[PDB]
Amino acid sequence: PVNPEKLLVITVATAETEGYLRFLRSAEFFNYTVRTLGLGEEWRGGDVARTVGGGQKVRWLKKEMEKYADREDMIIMFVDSYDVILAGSPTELLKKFVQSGSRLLFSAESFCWPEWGLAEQYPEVGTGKRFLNSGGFIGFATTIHQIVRQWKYKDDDDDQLFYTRLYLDPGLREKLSLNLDHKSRIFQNLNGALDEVVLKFDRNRVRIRNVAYDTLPIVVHGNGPTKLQLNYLGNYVPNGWTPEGGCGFCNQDRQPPPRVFLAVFVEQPTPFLPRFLQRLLLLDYPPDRVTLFLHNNEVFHEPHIADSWPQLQDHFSAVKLVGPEEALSPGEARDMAMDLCRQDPECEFYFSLDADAVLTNLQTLRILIEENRKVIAPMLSRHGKLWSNFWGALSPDEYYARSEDYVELVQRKRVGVWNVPYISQAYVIRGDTLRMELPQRDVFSGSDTDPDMAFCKSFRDKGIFLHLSNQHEFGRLLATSRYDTEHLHPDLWQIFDNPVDWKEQYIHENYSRALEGEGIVEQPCPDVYWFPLLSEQMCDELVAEMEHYGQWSGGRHEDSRLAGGYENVPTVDIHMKQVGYEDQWLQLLRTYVGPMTESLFPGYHTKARAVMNFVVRYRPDEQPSLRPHHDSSTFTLNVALNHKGLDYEGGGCRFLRYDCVISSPRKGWALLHPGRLTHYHEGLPTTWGTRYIMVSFVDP
Amino acid sequence: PVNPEKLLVITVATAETEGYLRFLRSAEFFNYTVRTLGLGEEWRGGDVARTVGGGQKVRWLKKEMEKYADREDMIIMFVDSYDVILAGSPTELLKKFVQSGSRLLFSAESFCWPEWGLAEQYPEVGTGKRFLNSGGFIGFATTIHQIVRQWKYKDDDDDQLFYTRLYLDPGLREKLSLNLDHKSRIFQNLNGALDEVVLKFDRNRVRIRNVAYDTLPIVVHGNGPTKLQLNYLGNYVPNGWTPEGGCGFCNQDRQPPPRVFLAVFVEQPTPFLPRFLQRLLLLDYPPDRVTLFLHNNEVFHEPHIADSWPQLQDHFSAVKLVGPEEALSPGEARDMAMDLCRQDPECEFYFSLDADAVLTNLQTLRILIEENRKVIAPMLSRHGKLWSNFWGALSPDEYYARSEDYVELVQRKRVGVWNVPYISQAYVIRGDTLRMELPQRDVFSGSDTDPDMAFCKSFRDKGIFLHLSNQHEFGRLLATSRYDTEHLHPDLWQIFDNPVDWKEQYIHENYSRALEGEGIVEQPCPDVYWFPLLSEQMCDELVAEMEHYGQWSGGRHEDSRLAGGYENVPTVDIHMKQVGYEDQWLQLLRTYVGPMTESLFPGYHTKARAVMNFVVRYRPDEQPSLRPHHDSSTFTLNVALNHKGLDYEGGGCRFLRYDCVISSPRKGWALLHPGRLTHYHEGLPTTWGTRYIMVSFVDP
Ligand SMILES: O=c1ccn([C@@H]2O[C@H](COP(=O)(O)OP(=O)(O)O[C@H]3OC[C@@H](O)[C@H](O)[C@H]3O)[C@@H](O)[C@H]2O)c(=O)[nH]1
Ligand SMILES: O=c1ccn([C@@H]2O[C@H](COP(=O)(O)OP(=O)(O)O[C@H]3OC[C@@H](O)[C@H](O)[C@H]3O)[C@@H](O)[C@H]2O)c(=O)[nH]1
Ligand SMILES: *[C@@H]1O[C@H](CO)[C@@H](O[C@@H]2O[C@H](CO)[C@@H](O)[C@H](O)[C@H]2NC(C)=O)[C@H](O)[C@H]1NC(C)=O
Ligand SMILES: *[C@@H]1O[C@H](CO)[C@@H](O[C@@H]2O[C@H](CO)[C@@H](O)[C@H](O)[C@H]2NC(C)=O)[C@H](O)[C@H]1NC(C)=O
Ligand SMILES: *[C@@H]1O[C@H](CO)[C@@H](O)[C@H](O)[C@H]1NC(C)=O
Ligand SMILES: *[C@@H]1O[C@H](CO)[C@@H](O)[C@H](O)[C@H]1NC(C)=O
Ligand SMILES: O=C(O)CCC(=O)C(=O)O
Ligand SMILES: O=C(O)CCC(=O)C(=O)O
Ligand SMILES: [Fe+2]
Ligand SMILES: [Fe+2]
Ligand SMILES: [Fe+2]
Ligand SMILES: [Fe+2]
Ligand SMILES: [Mn+2]
Ligand SMILES: [Mn+2]
């Protein structure tokens, strides 16, 4: 058994990149011994991701190997560091090396690179990989020194070609006992073998398994165009995320805070923007340490920004508004906001937030800053759907693709901080990263590529990890796809696209607690129940939308009411189908009135059918009252839309057979009474002002 | 001015017939002086209504006139008595006689009788009547004596021919100044002039007016085949019935009573015969003075007669039953019953009563006996219709005809005792009339004529008046036309044909008082009303009719009930349409449940639509309960059909949302509760016996 104290891992790294630190973490997990060559030096090996080169690695290794030229007792493994993670122990590594019977074992790959013609000089192998890969090899220090000492070439010459031609010398190959890891027992190069590699999980550790050769490799090399696939594996292997310990690089549990440049982007008509702007004032971060930048591209949102701008300017240390009259494109606005933080050394963190991002966690900014990453984004999903603000994978031409663990992350079956290829809508970028690693102005612009994609690609080109955290509940994403702005209050029509946000804005705040019991629902008259339904904003906007239409009924008008025999009992009103809001109001009936009715009348079941839905207006000089009658309905919904005294005097509902009077209606509250046989009722005269009510004859 | 003390009326009468007494009454009304010739003698003038004759009148007048042969101061009017009424005063009579300028004025008529060939010897007249009528003439005693003294012929020779040939002597006509009353100024012969005579009314007196000649005749002669028309006029003229004094020959205001032979006739299947038989025990007349005869021709009624025969035999002095096994025809049975009283000198009055006669006035027998007529009938009409138990007129061939005052009598605009040509169903005949005036056995039989018509014709042939009294409310006539006896209880199906009687038998006795307020209706649970509806007999017969059908439902059966979502809530029941009683029960709903519902739920209006009508049976070994559910109805009718404790234990209705239980239902009482939304209810288990209820889902 070879002593693990005799094993030395040698790698090359000119800077402590995130890839290098990910490698060191995997090495320290198995208690490896790693000597790093080249830290602080300039990389003279040319463009590594674009062409051949990397000879500077061999030059540095050759100089380092002169100390160990006679050390037969020492085993040395050389690996890359930026795109390599370790998945096995040094004990298992050395046992597999001895089993190989080799004295210097190179990794094998599918492609004969960089000279494809040399592939016939290679020995013929069976199902295994056939050609040498310089990204990783392990052997005796003496044998390695005899190979690397022959290096006499330029810093940008290809290292793999140098090792390949030495391996293709049959005399040298057999004298020094050089070999290749054909079946990936030790080294797993990913390029050309993505469909052979799967994750193998354990309790507190993850590995990869080669399903082609049924092996458990020690070294995972994301060589060539497999960087993102290695990022994916690196989220688990070796102790990234485990079924028992969760993520092992996050903060599972949570004096001046860093100064932050908060940039808000409104690049399309967005629902509930006033609610988004008011939510900025509620973010749990000292506003004296936050600078606000807001780019609005929509003239539709100019009144919204203007309403809240005094409070924003009074809240944050400094504010800046870039409006639609500046003709900025989204890529230009995002370049400008980011460069405003880059050119300010007092900007310690950059926080980009889009209008369709609803942050339910007011501690989002603290949590992401405390995660201490270069770039990190909170996970935000469309409510009840799989769509969210990140991608797990890329198609070969850098387009959307679904990763194998995307659904587990969105559903939060696995939580942590994840290295992902794409993020959007909300992210926190370290300001020093913008200054030292991405100093260019054209991060979002420069191409015909989409700005969101150009931003992520600009960071991936620099080796910057794009982190995504589902460690906490952060928020959701608003549906903005087909937002109809051709209304006086477009957010009234958002009951389908954004139901959660529509409820919080238009459904009464105490509605849910009333539905869950708690003695909020009243019964002022026998079998006439009284519960809060609509918020004051819903009533104010609904009435406003009615008067904006203006076509109130009068004579020649018929309602589904029943007086003495044949008799016409009309109201001055506007029906929901007149204004195009019936489909929306019927959804409110199905979602909110239906379940309330079944709770109050045990035994009754309803789908909330309603042909007659309309808003009644009462006025002393128009029609101030409604004479006794029945309703063509099983039960009737009567919602007060304004305040008694403030907006009108008099009014009220009176149930004759009980001598019971709803003297003082409540704005947004609803009456629930049977419509036939027993509740002959009457609308008491409106003596002053104007009285609005919303009426629905349910289940006719 | 001729002194009325010089006027003498001479008439002939062998007996004081009703016609003679009607004449004397009219004479005494105007204070006439009447000498009657021939009382007590045998009529030897032959058949007067069948051929020529009447010379016995002239023989008696001739002998009487010898006293007055020289009395120039005396005016004498001769008239018939059996078919003559007086309509004017002697003063008006004598003024018109002087105006004629005649010394002996005969009545004129349209027909030259009895020798039609003599009519050319008559003088030519204009529009007036041309020929002599011997029924009435007025003249000086001297002139009359010179005419009648020439009588030298047989008792059965024609008097009119004797007077006619004397009048056709032109020398005698002009010497004695004989004349005819061409334009009916004094005498009005009815034969050949019915369309010229109308009644002229006054405050306390009625006359007749001749519309052809615009005259007011003094003497009305119903000569020949106009007896019934004179009977009609005699009901008014001169003081029969007047607009101010009413009838002047009736009892407008009401110690052993006379013995009576009560004959009951059941000649067809008759509805409510048990109720008729029980009503006999309630007639307000001492039953020790009544003999009961009952002829039943229907085997369908044998059980009914048998049920009540012990009580009848115990009630009346003597009883006799003639059943269907005797093969008697209605004419033979009515002959037998009438002759049983005729051959008994202890029978003082005969009271014939048919099964379709409902006597609502228990004092009917006293009232009719106190009227002191030979034959008298109480007016009984079909409820709300014009059909009744008498005719006002006859067609020329002795068939039905409507008299000019028929509707006034049936509607009781004119009330009194009326001389009518036909009566039926109920009449009281003086026993001595049967013994002295109609001794024949074949009163109803003998012809192919209908028995009811043969009976009336037998009395009209003898000059017996058939009196009808609408002076009081006496009763009604049952509809027996299409009585369907193919049921276990046929009277259940009588809601249409006899609604008044159907109500009194099957609608609860305290129902009406409950509908009119009076605090009988209860409200045991909120909006669940409780009122009496069906009598105990209705419940017992309805349940019996259900079990006689026997086809109770079970599995595979569906009702219009609503449980949790889609759910089947059936009952072991029989629907009304299965047994052919839906049209009848729907009538009960329209007539009795409808108005009660509108009274209890002010504002609601209903036509009592009900598709689901059925009788539910609950049993411990079958289906003892009904689980919570709603009803496919606006309101539900729940009628208990038997007694709790006596017929079943347990059971009852429970309304869940009110924690209210109808623990003790009442037989024949009905529950009225809404069927939807608020009154989720349940049928409590029937632990012992059998529980029946009638259910209707109204206004679905
Ligand atoms: O700026 C740098 C770039 C690279 N390196 C070292 O050199 C190693 C090679 O870089 P990469 O992993 O990105 O390159 P790949 O493994 O994808 O394949 C590439 O390797 C080197 C290139 O010259 C080859 O042409 C190509 O095969 C790195 O893992 C790192 O250890 C630095 O130390 N500083
Ligand atoms: O039985 C009788 C019948 C008749 N009379 C007297 O004789 C009168 C004539 O009898 P009716 O009124 O019934 O006969 P009418 O007036 O209809 O015509 C008839 O009169 C007598 C007949 O002989 C004639 O042939 C016919 O014209 C009676 O009014 C009555 O006063 C009797 O006193 N006893
Ligand atoms: C929702 O419920 C709360 C409490 O149940 C309501 O609150 C109160 O408001 C009144 C005056 O508006 C105060 O006098 C009370 O002290 C408040 N109580 C509490 C506990 O805060 C609240 O008004 C309800 N919402 C609406 C829209 O009516
Ligand atoms: C109709 O109403 C009368 C009285 O309102 C009911 O009569 C009483 O019957 C009870 C026992 O049945 C007696 O104790 C009372 O004394 C009776 N009262 C009177 C005033 O007679 C009668 O029962 C009702 N009819 C039905 C069918 O229930
Ligand atoms: C690494 O070595 C330390 C001793 O310095 C030991 O506590 C730890 O358990 C080792 N880890 C593994 C995975 O063997
Ligand atoms: C008839 O005479 C009596 C007197 O005896 C008189 O009282 C009565 O009024 C008279 N009737 C008429 C109608 O003249
Ligand atoms: O004004 C009211 O409160 C009653 C009006 C009513 O019942 C209706 O909407 O038909
Ligand atoms: O048994 C009862 O009283 C209730 C039965 C019922 O409600 C029904 O007829 O459907
Ligand atoms: Fe309307
Ligand atoms: Fe209403
Ligand atoms: Fe049924
Ligand atoms: Fe029911
Ligand atoms: Mn590499
Ligand atoms: Mn006569």
Side-chain angles (χ1 to χ4, degrees), chain B residues 669-683:
Chain B
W669 282 63
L671 287 175
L672 228 49
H673 65 84
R676 297 187 167 107
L677 174 60
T678 55
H679 290 67
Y680 207 53
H681 51 281
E682 182 179 19

Side-chain angles (χ1 to χ4, degrees), chain B residues 208-223:
Chain B
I208 63 149
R209 161 182 283 152
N210 188 292
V211 297
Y213 315 112
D214 199 4
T215 63
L216 296 177
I218 302 296
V219 180
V220 191
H221 189 194
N223 61 317

Side-chain angles (χ1 to χ4, degrees), chain B residues 557 559 571 573 575:
Chain B
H557 187 50
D559 270 286
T571 38
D573 49 49
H575 280 248

Side-chain angles (χ1 to χ4, degrees), chain A residues 527 529 563-565 597 600-605 630 634-635 657-658 674 676-678 680, chain B residues 527 529 563-565 597 600-605 630 634-635 657-658 674 676-678 680:
Chain A
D527 289 328
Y529 290 95
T597 297
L600 295 173
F601 302 97
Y604 189 70
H605 290 100
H630 289 105
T634 302
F635 71 94
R657 283 193 58 252
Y658 307 94
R676 297 187 167 107
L677 174 60
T678 55
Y680 207 53
Chain B
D527 289 328
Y529 290 95
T597 297
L600 295 173
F601 302 97
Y604 189 70
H605 290 100
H630 289 105
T634 302
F635 71 94
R657 283 193 58 252
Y658 307 94
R676 297 187 167 107
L677 174 60
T678 55
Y680 207 53

Side-chain angles (χ1 to χ4, degrees), chain B residues 475-520:
Chain B
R476 53 183 182 268
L477 286 185
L478 293 182
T480 68
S481 65
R482 285 196 139 248
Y483 181 45
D484 196 343
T485 72
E486 296 188 41
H487 300 287
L488 185 65
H489 301 274
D491 293 336
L492 273 179
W493 277 263
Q494 283 295 297
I495 186 161
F496 298 118
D497 297 334
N498 294 279
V500 169
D501 296 270
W502 192 96
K503 177 187 188 299
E504 299 179 355
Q505 176 145 308
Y506 296 113
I507 293 303
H508 198 275
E509 62 159 359
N510 289 325
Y511 162 84
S512 286
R513 268 175 47 249
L515 174 60
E516 264 56 35
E518 234 153 287
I520 303 184

Side-chain angles (χ1 to χ4, degrees), chain A residues 561 626 629-631 636 673 681 697:
Chain A
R561 303 187 177 98
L626 190 50
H629 64 280
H630 289 105
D631 289 330
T636 298
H673 65 84
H681 51 281
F697 294 161

Side-chain angles (χ1 to χ4, degrees), chain A residues 521-530 655 660-662 666 671:
Chain A
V521 177
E522 315 217 54
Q523 187 179 178
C525 304
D527 289 328
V528 179
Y529 290 95
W530 205 8
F655 296 91
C660 191
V661 176
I662 313 303
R666 307 186 222 185
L671 287 175

